[PDB]
Design a protein around this ligand. Sequence first.
Ligand SMILES: *[C@@H]1O[C@H](CO)[C@@H](O)[C@H](O)[C@H]1NC(C)=O
Length: 221
Amino acid sequence: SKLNLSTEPCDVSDIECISKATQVFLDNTYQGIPEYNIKKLDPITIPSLEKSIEKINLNVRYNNLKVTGFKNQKISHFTLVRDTKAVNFKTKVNFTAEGKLVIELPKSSKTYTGEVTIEASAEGGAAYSYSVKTDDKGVEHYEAGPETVSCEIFGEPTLSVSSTLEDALKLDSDFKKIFTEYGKQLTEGRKQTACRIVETVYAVSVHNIRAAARILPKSAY
Ligand SMILES: *[C@@H]1O[C@H](CO)[C@@H](O)[C@H](O)[C@H]1NC(C)=O
């Protein structure tokens, strides 16, 4: 004993332990473990994110967004309320989302498609509670319930486009009319989109904790 640095399962009031077990898990599962219903988190591809601001007459659609950086996410807060087994934790993350942008200008019947890269620094949070459930036939497991995700962005995301796509947009009068009169709100849109990426990926990562809690007994508590 005297010098035991052996890790062992956490006591329910042992918060920095459970926080740390949450971190070890994230760090060793971001590649995915499909054998146990654990999804990849870095890289993670978001297939589609369509969006339409009316009647500023513009549709913007991000396609096949490859998101990287979540492997590096670091827990910044971790609450566990023993009465409800209610969990709340936040991580800090810097990600890059890389894919295709489609800009449609419906009143002109035009479309442009080029490469896009978004980068943000954020802090996202997840809140949910555990129930212990049957759960099949004598095996009892923790069951994480539906979560709420928060999103805070630090600074302003950088949005970056191919230079051919910049040129095409600069040279389009319908788009320029919008950028000139509504530049503000487009810039808004960019922060909404960062929070959408964050929401999407944090739901996956809680899916993963949820999937792990189903397999385990878990006197890994
Ligand atoms: C997160 O991104 C920001 C730059 O916007 C900076 O704090 C740092 O390079 C990143 N964090 C870490 C731990 O690298």
